[PDB]
DNA sequence: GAGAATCCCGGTGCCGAGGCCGCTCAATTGGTCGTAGACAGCTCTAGCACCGCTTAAACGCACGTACGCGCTGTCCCCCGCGTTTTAACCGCCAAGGGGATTACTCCCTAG
DNA sequence: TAGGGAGTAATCCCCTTGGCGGTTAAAACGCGGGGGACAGCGCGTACGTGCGTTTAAGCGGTGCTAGAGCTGTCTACGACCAATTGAGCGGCCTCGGCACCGGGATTCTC
């Protein structure tokens, strides 16, 4: 069960460019890019958790790490979309 | 007079510590500019680091770990 | 016929315009084996590892050619020289 | 019942990144908003890259996504190049740039 | 000697005492407590 | 004859992807030396990686970590 | 409450150069140096063990780390010194 | 008797062992790793100490100053590109003069 | 040969460097046990060798011109120094902001 | 489910901020002037450009098998809890090496 992100980026490509296909080398580009971003953001969040005598990683540390990693317009759009997703998930009532 | 806190003998000394002999008479402004961008990068990272810590003064520990993030790590002021 | 300098622009456009590899594969594979057997003898190699080495040295060399051409224009010249290469290597940081 | 990705309105998985965060030994305690925040950030980044790649692939008048289009989308954009100013690309090529005085 | 007992936990122990009394009575009706006095949300937009 | 096994018109092709018009005659052997020390610094790390992997075959993973660690990470071959 | 490495480098200094004295800024810069070297070696061993399909940390991961991150001459000197120390420790069983 | 004295060192193997235990780098850590790490740290500390010493003797001072070990780490090449990306405290730059700046 | 301008040497004030002591919380010792790791065994993907063949490319070489490189005059723009203006440094007492630490209930997250 | 890290209020007191004002070395202005930037020029030589000869680059065919990869079994290593004692940190104190300071040797410079 070798695990990869192929199906998910296949659909989010399919909701905006329906008549377009992906090559396998390109498929690997997006897979490696997603894994690299995940690794960078997660190790920065762990470093910031170890900053403050804190043994728990929560959403605030990842928000600070996103504001640290990304450039500014990407950062403000990422925290806007992530905050909307968190408020969608939390108000599941 | 805001940016004019740093001056001609200061950057003359800094260029002399670069081992240069002849300077130009209007290398002033681009050095002032790169000065400004280096400080605003460093204290922007320091402000975010101290914002997450709920510490509304900027400490030395934050700026040395800001440099260690930036790849210009400092020794002697903690770490 | 063409004046000297127009067909050079044509082929530099053709080389920037394409994406093919520019290094012959078998001399590179021989070079990799002969440069690896000193560290560890009777080694085995993967084909995509050779491809990774290929694309890494291609990217490194073309970036090196950017900043050595920047050294060439900086000294009010066109042809690169060895001191341009040494200046680019020094200003990059490594020795 | 139903997954947390549809609960938060996302297509990327949430339990998968929760698992990958769990035994990735970043910390011994992980909150509940952490995978949904990471999932939304990865959503936005993949969607932006796929938007620019599809625009470059259409710009080539060619119906698939080839890594030359990925290179064009990465280096044409300003802060995507700033985020990816370190990573070397596979089978991408180099953007066309000639310095001004070499033109006669 | 008393604990400090700030204003946030006075509400907490008051409604926990009210809930304890109501659950005892279920196994009655309040008249005028601190939470029945509270104004309801409005019905106009 | 393997150090100049890669050849000089190939070096010209890589240079004219790199956008340089005229090249010297004395730059071929120094680019060969730069190339040789670059692969030396890469497969030293790669052969330590495959030595610790209890393997004789150098795979794509060992070389891709080897250029990942030197700040030259490469996409696509890491799958 | 503050943690340092004072007396051990002090006695190493006395047994090596018995007529030398250390400033507190020097005390701090080699504390920063030793913490940096500790952090580098330990994160290299952690990444290696995590991405080498193993769950524990042993002497092999750290000998790869001291062979790999720092230049070869003092690397093999430290490898010889540490193998001598670990054979001394294993001898006293 | 401490384990550092059992292995014949002056560095706190229990302290370095707990410092790598509560750092979540792994969930199970063997026993050869702390003695090996404390041996490597002892060797490197002894090395930088003896370069500091021999940089202190020629500069007519019996106290080590950060300037002296700045020249010690700028004069030895192995420590120079071991620590090339770091910068140190009030030690300045080692003196060098390039020849065309030298007149006559 | 004048003229500063570093280096040397003796004297002196001074403040952190090293040594010592109280004592805490962390290193060590010791036994249990689930389990990751060693390790033998086994399937088969894939890496190595290589016989020969078309030919693109590599190599070689002749011709010549844009260009590297030395020379040079000239505008001028920084260098060196004296004077004047200005704010940096320093002593330093003081108000209080705001972490450091402490106490403690509880929602929050591992299992 | 249930243990515990985190939320939260109080509270001690360290350090930072303001500001007298006095000093004085450091910055600002200005001005002569000379070594250097820079435009122009010209010998020539090294490398572009193009053509003939040569070489082993690429293919692809396939056999051999090395070892990468997977599985089951055994077991020996390391987490985990508990008792406990001295190593090692906070604080205090004497003093000597280097900071300071001044006279004069001495060695670059024009």
Curated annotation (Swiss-Prot), chains B, F:
GO terms for biological process: nucleosome assembly. It comes from Xenopus laevis (African clawed frog). It comes from the Eukaryota. The modification N6-propionyllysine is found at residues 8, 21, 54, 56, 68. The modification N6-succinyllysine is found at residues 8, 54, 68. There is a cross-link at residue 8 (Glycyl lysine isopeptide (Lys-Gly) (interchain with G-Cter in UFM1)). The nucleosome is a histone octamer containing two molecules each of H2A, H2B, H3 and H4 assembled in one H3-H4 heterotetramer and two H2A-H2B heterodimers. The octamer wraps approximately 147 bp of DNA. This is Histone H4. The modification Phosphotyrosine is found at residues 28, 65. GO terms for cellular component: nucleosome; nucleus. The modification N6-glutaryllysine is found at residues 8, 36, 54, 56, 68. The keyword Transmembrane helix does not apply. There is a cross-link at residue 68 (Glycyl lysine isopeptide (Lys-Gly) (interchain with G-Cter in ubiquitin)). The lineage of its organism: Eukaryota, Metazoa, Chordata, Craniata, Vertebrata. The modification N6-butyryllysine is found at residues 8, 21, 54, 56, 68. The modification Phosphoserine is found at residue 24. It is found in: Nucleus; Chromosome. GO terms for molecular function: DNA binding; protein heterodimerization activity; structural constituent of chromatin. Belongs to the histone H4 family. The modification N6-lactoyllysine is found at residues 8, 54, 68. Demethylation is performed by JMJD6. Monomethylation is performed by KMT5A/SET8. Trimethylation is performed by KMT5B and KMT5C and induces gene silencing. The modification N6-(2-hydroxyisobutyryl)lysine is found at residues 8, 21, 36, 54, 56, 68. Its main location: nucleus. Keywords: Acetylation, Chromosome, Citrullination, DNA-binding, Hydroxylation, Isopeptide bond, Methylation, Nucleosome core, Nucleus, Phosphoprotein, Ubl conjugation.
UniProtKB/Swiss-Prot annotation, chain C:
The modification N6-methyllysine is found at residue 40. One of its GO terms (molecular function) is DNA binding. The modification N6,N6-dimethyllysine is found at residue 40. It is found in: Nucleus; Chromosome. The modification N6-succinyllysine is found at residue 40. Its main location: nucleus. It comes from the Eukaryota. GO terms for biological process: aerobic respiration; chromatin organization; global genome nucleotide-excision repair; intracellular copper ion homeostasis; nucleolar large rRNA transcription by RNA polymerase I; positive regulation of transcription by RNA polymerase I; regulation of DNA-templated transcription; rRNA transcription. Keywords: Acetylation, Chromosome, DNA-binding, Methylation, Nucleosome core, Nucleus, Phosphoprotein. Phosphorylated by IPL1 to form H3S10ph in a cell cycle-dependent manner during mitosis and meiosis. H3S10ph is also formed by SNF1, promotes subsequent H3K14ac formation by GCN5, and is required for transcriptional activation through TBP recruitment to the promoters. Dephosphorylation is performed by GLC7. The modification N6-propionyllysine is found at residue 17. Coiled coil: none annotated. The modification N6-acetyllysine is found at residues 17, 25. The modification N6,N6,N6-trimethyllysine is found at residue 40. The modification N6-malonyllysine is found at residue 17. GO terms for cellular component: CENP-A containing nucleosome; nucleosome; nucleus; RNA polymerase I upstream activating factor complex. Present with 213000 molecules/cell in log phase SD medium. Belongs to the histone H3 family. This is Histone H3. The chain holds residues 41 to 135 of 136 of the full protein.
Curated annotation (Swiss-Prot), chain D:
Induction: Transcribed during late G1 and S-phase, repressed in G2. Phosphorylated to form H2AS128ph (gamma-H2A) in response to DNA double-strand breaks (DSBs) generated by exogenous genotoxic agents and by stalled replication forks. Phosphorylation is dependent on the DNA damage checkpoint kinases MEC1/ATR and TEL1/ATM, spreads on either side of a detected DSB site and may mark the surrounding chromatin for recruitment of proteins required for DNA damage signaling and repair. The keyword DNA repair applies. It comes from the Eukaryota. One of its GO terms (cellular component) is nucleosome. Keywords: Acetylation, Chromosome, DNA damage, DNA repair, DNA-binding, Isopeptide bond, Methylation, Nucleosome core, Nucleus, Phosphoprotein, Ubl conjugation. The modification N6-succinyllysine is found at residue 7. It is found in: Nucleus; Chromosome. The modification N5-methylglutamine is found at residue 91. The keyword Ubl conjugation applies. GO terms for biological process: chromatin organization; DNA repair; heterochromatin formation; negative regulation of transcription by RNA polymerase II. Belongs to the histone H2A family. The nucleosome is a histone octamer containing two molecules each of H2A, H2B, H3 and H4 assembled in one H3-H4 heterotetramer and two H2A-H2B heterodimers. The octamer wraps approximately 147 bp of DNA. The [ST]-Q motif constitutes a recognition sequence for kinases from the PI3/PI4-kinase family. This is Histone H2A.1. The chain holds residues 16 to 119 of 132 of the full protein.
Swiss-Prot record, chain E:
The keyword Heme does not apply. It is found in: Nucleus. Keywords: Nucleus, Transcription, Transcription regulation. It comes from the Eukaryota. GO terms for cellular component: Ino80 complex; nucleus. Its main location: nucleus. Belongs to the IES6 family. Present with 1720 molecules/cell in log phase SD medium. Component of the chromatin-remodeling INO80 complex, at least composed of ARP4, ARP5, ARP8, RVB1, RVB2, TAF14, NHP10, IES1, IES3, IES4, IES6, ACT1, IES2, IES5 and INO80. Probably involved in transcription regulation via its interaction with the INO80 complex, a chromatin remodeling complex. Also involved in the regulation of telomere length. This is Chromatin-remodeling complex subunit IES6. It comes from Saccharomyces cerevisiae (strain ATCC 204508 / S288c) (Baker's yeast). The lineage of its organism: Eukaryota, Fungi, Dikarya, Ascomycota, Saccharomycotina.
């Amino acid at each position: 069960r070798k695990e990869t992100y192929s199906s998910y980026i296949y659909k989010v490509l399919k909701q905006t460019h329906p008549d377009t296909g992906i090559s396998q080398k390109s498929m690997s580009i997006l897979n490696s890019f997603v894994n690299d971003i995940f690794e960078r953001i997660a190790t920065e969040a762990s470093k910031l958790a170890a900053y403050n005598k804190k043994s728990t990683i929560s959403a605030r540390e990842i928000q600070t790490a996103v504001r640290l990693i990304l450039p500014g317009e990407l950062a403000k759009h990422a925290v806007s979309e992530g905050t909307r997703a968190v408020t969608k998930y939390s108000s599941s009532t | 007079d805001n940016i004019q806190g740093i001056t001609k003998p200061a950057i003359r000394r800094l260029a002399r510590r670069g081992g240069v002999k002849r300077i130009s008479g209007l290398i002033y402004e681009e050095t002032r500019g790169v000065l400004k961008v280096f400080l605003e990068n460093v204290i922007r990272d320091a402000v975010t680091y101290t914002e997450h810590a709920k510490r509304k003064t900027v400490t030395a520990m934050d700026v040395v770990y800001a440099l260690k993030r930036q790849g210009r790590t400092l020794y002697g002021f903690g770490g | 016929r063409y004046k000297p300098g127009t067909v050079a622009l044509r082929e530099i456009r053709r080389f920037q315009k394409s994406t093919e590899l520019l290094i012959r594969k078998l001399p590179f594979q021989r070079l990799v084996r002969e440069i690896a057997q000193d560290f560890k003898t009777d080694l085995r190699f993967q084909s995509s590892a050779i491809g990774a080495l290929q694309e890494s040295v291609e990217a490194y060399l073309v970036s090196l050619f950017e900043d050595t051409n920047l050294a060439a224009i900086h000294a009010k010249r066109v042809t690169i020289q060895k001191k341009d290469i040494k200046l680019a290597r020094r200003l990059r940081g490594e020795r | 019942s139903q997954s947390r990705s549809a609960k938060a309105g996302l297509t990327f998985p949430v339990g998968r990144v929760h698992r990958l965060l769990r035994r990735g030994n970043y910390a011994q305690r992980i909150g509940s908003g952490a995978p949904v925040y990471l999932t939304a950030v990865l959503e936005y980044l993949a969607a932006e890259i796929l938007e620019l790649a599809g625009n470059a692939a259409r710009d080539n008048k060619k119906t698939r996504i080839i890594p030359r289009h990925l290179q064009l989308a990465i280096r044409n954009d300003d802060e995507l190049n700033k985020l990816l100013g370190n990573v070397t690309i596979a089978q991408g090529g180099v953007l066309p740039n000639i310095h001004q005085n070499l033109l006669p | 000697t008393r604990r400090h007992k700030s204003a946030r936990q006075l509400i907490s122990d008051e409604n926990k005492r009210i809930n304890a009394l109501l659950t005892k009575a279920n196994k009655l009706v309040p008249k005028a407590t601190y939470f029945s006095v509270e104004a309801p949300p409005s019905i106009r937009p």
